Amino acid sequence: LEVENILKRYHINYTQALIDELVDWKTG
Amino acid sequence: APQNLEVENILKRYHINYTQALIDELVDWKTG
Amino acid sequence: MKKPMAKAYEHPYNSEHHPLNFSAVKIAETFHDFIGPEQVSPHYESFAMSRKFLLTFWGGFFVLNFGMATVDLNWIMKSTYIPWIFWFQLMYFYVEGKNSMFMPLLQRFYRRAAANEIFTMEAFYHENIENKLRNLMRITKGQLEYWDIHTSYGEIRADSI
Amino acid sequence: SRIINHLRGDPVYQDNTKDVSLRGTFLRGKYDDLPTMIFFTEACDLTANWIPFFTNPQYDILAHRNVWLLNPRNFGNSDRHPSFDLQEMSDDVMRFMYSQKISMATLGGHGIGGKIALAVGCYHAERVTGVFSIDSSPMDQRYHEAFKEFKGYVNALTEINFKTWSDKDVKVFLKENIKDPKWRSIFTNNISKNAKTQSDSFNFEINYLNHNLNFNKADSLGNWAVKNGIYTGRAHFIFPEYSRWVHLATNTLPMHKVCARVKGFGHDIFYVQGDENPLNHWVYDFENYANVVASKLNKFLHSYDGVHALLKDRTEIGNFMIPDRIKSRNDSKHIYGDYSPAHLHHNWRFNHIYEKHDELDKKLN
Amino acid sequence: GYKIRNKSIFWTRAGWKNNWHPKNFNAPRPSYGEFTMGIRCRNDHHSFLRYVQTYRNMSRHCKQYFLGDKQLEETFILGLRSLFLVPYDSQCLTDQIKHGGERRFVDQLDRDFELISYNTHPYQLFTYTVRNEHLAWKNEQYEKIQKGEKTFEQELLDYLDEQVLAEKAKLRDGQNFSIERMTEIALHVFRKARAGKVRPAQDVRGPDGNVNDFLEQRRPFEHPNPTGVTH
Amino acid sequence: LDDIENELSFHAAIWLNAYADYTMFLFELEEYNDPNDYLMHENFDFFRGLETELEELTETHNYIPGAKDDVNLRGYLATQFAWGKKVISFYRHPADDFKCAKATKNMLGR
Amino acid sequence: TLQWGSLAERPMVDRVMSTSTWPVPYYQRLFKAYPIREKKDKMSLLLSDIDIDDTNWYQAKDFLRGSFRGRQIVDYVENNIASNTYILIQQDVANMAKAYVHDICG
Ligand SMILES: CCCCCCCCCCCCCCCCCC(=O)OC[C@H](COP(=O)([O-])OCC(O)COP(=O)([O-])OC[C@@H](COC(=O)CCCCCCCCCCCCCCCCC)OC(=O)CCCCCCCCCCCCCCCCC)OC(=O)CCCCCCCCCCCCCCCCC
Ligand SMILES: CCCCCCCCCCCCCCCCCC(=O)OC[C@H](COP(=O)([O-])OCC(O)COP(=O)([O-])OC[C@@H](COC(=O)CCCCCCCCCCCCCCCCC)OC(=O)CCCCCCCCCCCCCCCCC)OC(=O)CCCCCCCCCCCCCCCCC
């Protein structure tokens, strides 16, 4: 949930779809 | 530099306000 | 439980209100009984600032009271001129002149600086004494390690057989 | 990458209080040579939470100075030592400034970090240009309800044994004991796993901190001792209108008591207009509080920080003459008159800018 | 905490931490027999036996008022030795004292025994008070045990024994019950018991920063006139 | 075996008694705070026994401050900048006088 | 600062509150009131950092003799232990290890 934590720090409203695209971007 | 464009385009589609600090942290998060 | 002694020796000439021996502690107790407890004000403002106009009236009333009573006040002003000039010119250097002239005479400052440092040492008393105990507790814990080894010998001797 | 540079190190337990090195994040400014700012986060708070504040284009703080988001001892990444003396922690910063080749720096702090920043100005005033304290005051806070809660949370955090407890046991313990949402989130992020998945542990030294808070004596981080003295330089204080840490009724008086150059409310001491909310202590989370703090911070760094005491602003540098005391100069044939005080380059000790500009001056003449 | 920062704190004109032979102008100088006509000196070699007799006098004259309390006599002996062992263990070099340290301590102890012979020494009056307060508490326990009642000290001991069983019955992962854990169990019970008693306020400040005295009553004013006695 | 069983048992009781001393002191110290905020006679009551030793100094006329203290730390703080820097000698009584006098073949007893 | 106000309002600047209450009572407490010279149940704070000494073993015997097992320990130590002091200090495992090799042979 590192991607969720950095987004939370910046106070940016994040959707669940955005988190998956970012996780896939790192893993892929 | 190329990884900056990958994240920026992802943040572009969600019309989310992004800063260079966030991208640098996300890019550092990818390499880390 | 064995029955202890009924009482120790009771001195016939020593009491709490009239202690036989002397120290500043008993004098300090009777001193604070005299001046009483600290007169804590429960108010939101101090008494002087709330009654400045009133205290100014009574301040000038007693000045006028002394002024109206003293019919020879000019004789007292003239009689005070010589000692006022004499004592101020004589003690100027020892009180104020030393701060910018020949000698500083810092004896009284040294007494303030030492007391100001003691004020801090008393404020940090709990800290300094706790660090000294951390070393003694370390020594005590080191000696208690030998009993922990002995209490396992019975288990070691049983499991070895 | 480039703007965000945090040096990686491992905390080392030190027996000597002088062999303590501080670690933190460095934020590079927009321009080549700018003075540096050293900022201390709240006790047991992440330095990364302030990165979006100091890297916000709207605030544009990096346009003024380079920022070091530095952790104090026993916190985060820095070395651990059981002592929390403000003088010993202040000497840590001076060794950090030396190892980093910093001649003098601006000091900032949030909460208890504000006390630490102001303490460095008290013990090393010649190395500090100014102090900007956010929601703090040099006063004994051992009996403030906000500090008691923080003190109570640290005590409860000593119950957890990372070896025996599972991850689900820790999550339940924190939700039930730590009722404050922000303190809960901060303490979770301080939990980290060591290399080779040995075990989990808090980033801050929980044992050394608990003894400091639980003892509740002069060396506690909530206390401000008379031993710290007086800060002689520029100081600015900002705190919320309804803050659980700084009460506007009386908690401003310590600022005049410790800081010699503080003029008073409306000049060096401001309150952010806001509502009653126990989370208003964390000004960087709310844009309303953050906008006012950033503007006041930019005003401090731009016009008031590192300016001589008897000058009003930076605008008077070079055009306002300060009176001189007689018999204060070594030259005997000196006509005493007013002078403009010398302001030096921010890192003149470790660069040769004065030698280089001397030679360029001779080419003119 | 706080440490003395002055490195020269213990420097004297005679050396570091010198409180045995301070430096003064009239320093001791030798005497030569062939050139000395007469001399007036009060020094002698009698301090050793005077030191022995003084210990016997102080011990025996204090035991007159102990009423045969054997434990008090043995406790007093340990205290009396701590008074006579001062020159043997002190940091001060008692053998290098200005004009004879042995004579100085013997004359100092004789002033103590003079007060002891009159039963007016503060160490004596302190001993009688401490022993009376101790025996009064021991007699309270004895009366409660003869009545089959359980003493307050036994209630805590029994309460602390069942706390260790409860903690060691739930702590099965580890089986090392340290003295640190044993201590914080008792202290948690001691604080709760001390807070339960109606004791006078010892700490300056309560939970708030305010003092815990009877004088710490500020506004708002909500108390009426004091009422009189009832019939 | 019973020799060390009882030897180590008594050895542990000695250092358990010392552990309880330091533990109980830190327990009573929790109620004592800011010695600067207590009155004079109340601070002596927390440190029971100091008033007794103070009476011993008075009744024996040992009214030279710090004479019987092995390290008169208060005496060093008071003389940090004194002329002829010195502290009182150990156990110096204000009444004792060890002055001597001799007559030699020369004048002034030289 | 050195400019705190008028002389009449001097006692005003001393109070510092730990709560947000208004108006604030100005008076700053100097000392703790001590109306009754009561003998405190608390033990003396002089017993702070004294090293090990004779009082430790003397009090250990007094508390051990309160038990049946402790009475056996004290009697055996004071009679059948070749030591020149009651202040027992363990600085080696010589007496411990030699007591185990003389016992485990069975
Ligand atoms: C028939 C008709 C006649 C009968 C009518 C009957 C009615 C008579 C009216 C009497 C009123 C009684 C009710 C009030 C009594 C106290 C008055 C007062 O000011 O108390 C507040 C004041 C502070 O109260 P607070 O606001 O709660 O602040 C608490 C903090 O502790 C504060 O400490 P802080 O340091 O933090 O703050 C500052 C502090 C700063 O103040 C101080 O801390 C000390 C000030 C100096 C004290 C006096 C030094 C005198 C040294 C002795 C030498 C003269 C002795 C006189 C007698 C000698 C023989 C003749 O005080 C202040 O707040 C501002 C100063 C207010 C003025 C007080 C000083 C005025 C002089 C009073 C002395 C009067 C006698 C000498 C006058 C000349 C001879 C007639 O307390 C004092 O100053 C105590 C001083 C001693 C009090 C008794 C003195 C005698 C009675 C005083 C009457 C004053 C007016 C008349 C004389 C004026 C001549 C110029
Ligand atoms: C044995 C002492 C001397 C005896 C001579 C008589 C006294 C001198 C007369 C003039 C007075 C000015 C000298 C300064 C005196 C300051 C002493 C002082 O006030 O205590 C401060 C002192 C601590 O305060 P401090 O701030 O640290 O003092 C340092 C100063 O502030 C400043 O710190 P500093 O480190 O710079 O001070 C060092 C001190 C060092 O002093 C010395 O070492 C003395 C020099 C060696 C002795 C030379 C005489 C040789 C004697 C043997 C030969 C005689 C033969 C005669 C025939 C044979 C007879 C059989 O002063 C000097 O350097 C003296 C040099 C003179 C400067 C000359 C500059 C040129 C002037 C050109 C214009 C001329 C205009 C003249 C108009 C009139 C003047 C206003 O308190 C103590 O030490 C207490 C212990 C007492 C010390 C021994 C007694 C000395 C007298 C003390 C005052 C009375 C004590 C009893 C009352 C106590 C309260 C109840």
Ligand SMILES: CCCCCCCCCCCCCCCCCC(=O)OC[C@H](COP(=O)([O-])OCC[N+](C)(C)C)OC(=O)CCCCCCCCCCCCCCCCC
């Ligand atoms: C205030 C009201 C009450 C007043 C009561 C009196 C208060 C007096 C306060 C104490 C001051 C006493 C001064 C004693 C000398 C201290 C200085 C010193 O020791 O000299 C060291 C001096 C100075 O050495 P130093 O190293 O300590 O200082 C060096 C000075 N500087 C730093 C500047 C380099 O060395 C000497 O040995 C000189 C000895 C000279 C002796 C001068 C004093 C002689 C008189 C003393 C005896 C008087 C007895 C009178 C009794 C009367 C009975 C009827």
